């Protein structure tokens, strides 16, 4: 499914500016920079005080639509995190960040997460030399996420890695722009992520 369709309507409905197109969510064209109200005929009307279930559902939907992961994989990852020892929320965020498509996005190979998903699915991304075409692939600490030697001549990768010159990467990632590769150093901490999501709200949403 992948929800494929309009994206900045989620930028509007969630009330927080999301980055689903990469660019144009920074440019004054996101429609969140100019239309912050939710979509539909009844978007500009006075909003009623939402229920607690409303708040938790909206927060979980925000966190899910940020990564573009379906409800099935999302709930499975949450249950997997809850089975493990440690804080459920931080482990859940580390699991979501460990996805191959999200790592490709974080490493600057793609401008958006869905563009990264298409780059992975089409075999333009390799892991430790071997080609991997699975967005749900879990990257372990130490894996070298590289670009296919046959794909390093493509225009989009040239553009993205030409813009990545001088740009800093996450504290848990390393980037080699000349070799067009990177390394997943460690699992990111909660302080490492600046996501506008309260993970405890999602934990309480699935606690029901």
């Amino acid at each position: 499914g992948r929800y494929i369709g309009p994206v900045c309507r989620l930028c509007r409905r969630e009330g927080v500016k999301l980055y689903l197109k990469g660019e144009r969510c920074y440019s004054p064209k996101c429609a969140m920079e100019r239309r912050p109200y939710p979509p539909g005929q009844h978007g500009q009307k006075r909003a009623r005080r939402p229920s607690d279930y409303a708040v938790r559902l909206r927060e979980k939907q925000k966190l899910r639509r940020i990564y573009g992961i379906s409800e099935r994989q999302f709930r499975n990852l949450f249950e997997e995190a809850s089975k493990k020892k440690g804080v459920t929320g931080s482990v859940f965020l580390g699991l979501l960040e460990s996805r191959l498509d999200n790592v490709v996005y974080r490493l600057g190979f793609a401008v958006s997460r869905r563009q990264a998903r298409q780059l992975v699915r089409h075999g333009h991304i390799t892991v430790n030399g071997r080609r991997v075409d699975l967005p749900s692939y879990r990257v372990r600490p130490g894996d070298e996420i590289a670009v296919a030697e046959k794909s390093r001549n493509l225009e989009l990768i040239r553009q993205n890695l030409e813009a990545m010159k001088g740009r800093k990467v996450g504290p848990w990632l390393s980037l080699d722009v000349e070799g067009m590769k990177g390394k997943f150093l460690r699992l990111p901490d909660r302080e490492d992520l600046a996501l506008p999501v309260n993970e405890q709200l999602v934990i309480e949403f699935y606690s029901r």
């Binding site: 607690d52 440690g86 804080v87 459920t88 929320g89 405890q200 934990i203 309480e204 606690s207």
Partner: protein
Amino acid sequence: DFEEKMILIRRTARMQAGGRRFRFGALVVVGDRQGRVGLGFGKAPEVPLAVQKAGYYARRNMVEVPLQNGTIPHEIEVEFGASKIVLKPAAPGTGVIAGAVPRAILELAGVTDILTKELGSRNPINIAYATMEALRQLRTKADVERLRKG
């Protein structure tokens, strides 16, 4: 400095020659999330006045909660009327698992991980009073050894 959240708002009715006349009641919890909570039930002919009065009464009735790493020091069990509240400490990463009323009361108290259960009557007023008395009957190890000095 003080967070304020309403539990429930209801409209009661008294009978008078001519018809029924309404009066609004509202529960309000106030907390600094540092270990202090307060519960208040305010009644007024209109809703905003009732909410303000409940906030005043809540700020007037405070309870110091002995938090121990975001959780409770020991499991408690309080019967208020027919409503029973059961509280139990939890390890971090668990979250607050409670009904709406106790979740709000404990969140405003500064609790982050706890396990609760409502038994008997599910009345929100009595459940709130039972949770308040539960937080009031909390003792620390320091308090325990203080009571057994002799």
